[PDB]
Amino acid sequence: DQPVQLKLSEYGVIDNLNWQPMQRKTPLANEVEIEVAAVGLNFRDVLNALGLLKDYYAEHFNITSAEQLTFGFECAGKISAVGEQVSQWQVGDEVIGLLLHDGLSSFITTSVEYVVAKPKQMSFSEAATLPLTFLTAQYGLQHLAKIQPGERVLIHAAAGGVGQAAVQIAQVAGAEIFATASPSKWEFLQSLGIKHIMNSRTLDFAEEIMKRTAGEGVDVVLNSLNGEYIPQSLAVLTPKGRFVEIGKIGIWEKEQVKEKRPDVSYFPFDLQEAVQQQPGLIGQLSEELTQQWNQGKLKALPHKVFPSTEITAAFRYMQQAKHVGKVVVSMP
């Protein structure tokens, strides 16, 4: 009763985010409806609300208006309704919504392709830390870079959401981890078992990597930093090294990367785009992560929880938490 959806009246004003009543929908034949308990929040939601992705949204989703937008890319909750040709799921099943556009709603509907079981061990907010971070890191490190035992990987902003999942994935793969974060997060990174810890707010990390690797550099970079961090990170890759780029604003064109380091493989990607362009990918990634989870090699992330009533505060925090910390909104 009284289901709601987060909506934006006009671009560029976070204060104009409001919970509006929503009309519940009957799921189509291969969809389910999920009553949402927790929603992962992401920097992308903020960029969206601030009007910084207007062109992208028109060209990819034909969204041309602020009042058209929704928020929330991932969630956890319980099945509330099942489409006619859905056999795997029943009302009351605890589930994770892996890839969504409207997570910040009391109820969502989604294709079963984007739904997996919630572990009984996990709280809903723990479950909501998983999808975007682990799917992005799994795709970037295991599908694109194809990291191997013994290889060296630099993970920038390793205390951020994707950064932390990447640490887990790389450790599982037997990779040697080099990490950057703010100095106030270094002690957190040491406790993850990382031995090479450097500042993400200066450029000294390159010199340090070269010193520690006796001039060889690293095999793989997973990057989300822009400005001078891009050329400086390209400079530390071994010949044939792989540069995986997951930022969206201010990233380099492949031509620019080619000119500076023709010996390097450049893998810029957006997770939703890759899923769109490669039918079956989401299923493959989920199967791989479920295996990792069943082997005891995947853990939910520490995270900040905001009650739904503090949605504006959560969006403002998400700007500060950009390079650090997973943020989750608890739903009424």
Side-chain angles (χ1 to χ4, degrees):
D1 284 310
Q2 298 196 161
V4 288
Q5 185 171 242
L6 190 68
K7 295 297 281 185
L8 187 66
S9 75
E10 70 199 9
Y11 286 112
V13 186
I14 284 177
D15 200 72
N16 275 0
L17 287 160
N18 61 113
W19 290 109
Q20 300 184 2
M22 67 163 282
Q23 191 88 31
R24 280 177 71 184
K25 308 154 65 175
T26 296
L28 308 174
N30 288 283
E31 299 183 331
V32 298
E33 193 195 33
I34 301 174
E35 186 168 5
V36 181
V39 185
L41 193 61
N42 289 283
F43 191 57
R44 183 161 168 172
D45 291 297
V46 179
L47 300 169
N48 207 5
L50 292 188
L52 293 168
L53 306 163
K54 286 169 75 180
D55 287 300
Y56 188 95
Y57 267 71
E59 288 175 45
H60 287 250
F61 317 113
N62 193 35
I63 292 165
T64 51
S65 175
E67 271 154 50
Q68 284 184 309
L69 292 177
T70 55
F71 305 85
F73 289 102
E74 65 199 323
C75 79
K78 298 173 195 287
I79 301 284
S80 55
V82 175
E84 207 218 10
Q85 293 181 322
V86 176
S87 62
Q88 262 219 358
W89 300 108
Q90 303 169 14
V91 176
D93 282 347
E94 302 189 333
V95 293
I96 300 169
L98 292 178
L99 189 109
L100 309 161
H101 61 288
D102 62 346
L104 289 154
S105 314
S106 307
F107 296 84
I108 61 88
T109 67
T110 183
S111 175
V112 293
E113 200 184 356
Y114 308 122
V115 177
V116 294
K118 176 175 104 35
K120 290 176 199 184
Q121 295 92 314
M122 257 171 216
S123 69
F124 288 100
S125 70
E126 282 171 332
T129 70
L130 305 183
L132 191 147
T133 59
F134 283 90
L135 295 168
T136 303
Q138 178 67 6
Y139 185 59
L141 294 176
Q142 283 284 358
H143 289 249
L144 295 186
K146 297 177 275 178
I147 55 171
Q148 297 302 308
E151 295 195 304
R152 296 181 180 109
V153 59
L154 168 63
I155 299 173
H156 275 316
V162 180
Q164 290 175 53
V167 166
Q168 289 185 39
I169 289 162
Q171 274 161 351
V172 164
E176 188 181 3
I177 297 170
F178 289 76
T180 66
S182 293
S184 72
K185 300 304 175 297
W186 292 353
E187 295 165 295
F188 176 65
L189 301 176
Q190 186 204 277
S191 78
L192 300 179
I194 300 160
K195 290 161 186 188
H196 313 287
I197 294 168
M198 293 158 292
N199 202 334
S200 57
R201 293 171 183 188
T202 65
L203 301 166
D204 280 333
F205 67 89
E207 177 175 358
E208 190 58 36
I209 286 165
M210 296 309 269
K211 180 172 184 190
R212 191 48 186 70
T213 66
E216 294 174 334
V218 298
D219 299 296
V220 177
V221 175
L222 183 69
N223 185 46
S224 58
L225 305 180
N226 49 37
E228 32 286 280
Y229 298 92
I230 294 171
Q232 189 72 333
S233 300
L234 287 166
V236 307
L237 273 175
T238 193
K240 292 189 282 185
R242 297 90 84 190
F243 190 99
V244 181
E245 172 66 69
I246 63 167
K248 281 194 72 281
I249 301 174
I251 67 164
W252 281 27
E253 301 298 317
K254 38 182 179 183
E255 290 67 31
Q256 303 171 306
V257 175
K258 181 155 81 175
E259 208 211 8
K260 187 195 187 283
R261 291 294 306 268
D263 50 344
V264 157
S265 296
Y266 182 47
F267 295 107
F269 81 91
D270 168 278
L271 180 74
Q272 299 213 159
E273 291 184 4
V275 164
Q276 182 182 62
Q277 293 164 7
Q278 190 183 337
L281 175 63
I282 187 91
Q284 193 177 22
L285 295 172
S286 173
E287 180 177 64
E288 296 159 3
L289 295 164
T290 304
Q291 276 277 185
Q292 173 173 337
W293 166 258
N294 288 332
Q295 286 192 34
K297 299 281 176 81
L298 187 147
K299 299 186 307 310
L301 310 187
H303 55 285
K304 188 102 151 86
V305 170
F306 287 81
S308 54
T309 59
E310 310 306 302
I311 192 63
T312 44
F315 269 70
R316 296 208 199 279
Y317 183 79
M318 190 75 267
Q319 302 172 50
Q320 294 178 308
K322 190 199 306 176
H323 306 297
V324 60
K326 185 63 194 170
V327 180
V328 174
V329 179
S330 192
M331 291 297 287

